[PDB]
Amino acid sequence: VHWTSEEKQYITSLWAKVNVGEVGGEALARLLIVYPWTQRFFASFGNLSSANAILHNAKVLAHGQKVLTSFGEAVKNLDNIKKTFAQLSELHCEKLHVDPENFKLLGNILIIVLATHFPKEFTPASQAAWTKLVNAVAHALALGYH
Template sequence: MLSKKEKKLIREIWERLSPVAEDIGADALLRYLLLLFFRCRMFASFPGTKTYFSHLDISRGSAHLSSHGKKIVLAIAEGAKDISQLTVTLAPLQTLHAYQLRIDPTNFKLLSHCMLVTLACYLGEGFTPEAHAAMDKFLSAFAAVLAEKYR
């Protein structure tokens, strides 16, 4: 899956970004929600999906968006510390999302794509093709691990 060099690169990126976790997470979540709302028109086509967000203020700059975004980024950063233990690290989140929140696992893939876009914006030229490829592999693995409980 990931080479030692890629794992090191991913760890370094997340260590560098953890101090701005709230900003990155809120930005990625907002991109994700806009993707769902505008591109897929999911809320209009499938009103039941609003239940995921009905209790949150999901407007730009809201405390809910920032807080939840920070949780997501810190969970990703924690997973990046020891990628070989990703399943163990994410076990509580797997259970939460699968059994309590009942989030459609497709959403993990969409969010990982939005996270890639956000990282590219924040890192600029530092988001090299190598970093992009490594991060894409890592976020795909992250999404797959979160979806494991659904099988």
């Protein structure tokens, strides 16, 4: 999506410092807590009955780690995002039937989490590149049926 060398640097530079397990657990827990309807898709994960239950839910945390690992595959190949997420697109759209709006919401949550973890590095300009990133992943996953 025509990344500038500067944008690519904001992304790869920050990601190298990211605790994927921690940021991933936070992002997914916050999705489930801030936008509670998303819990519909995680019935098998056990107790999600409160914010504290969700934050202590082992599978939520493990799953968040796998999700942020997936974002890492976008970071690692910024010019082939659409293709990298084709299979996941089919999964979320045809199998899981997750409305695409929720991809956007998870992206916004990740932006906020990155901000709490990297107060200094996450400048407005860094935010711009990372917002471009999460939106590109959301768009790629939305191709799944549109």
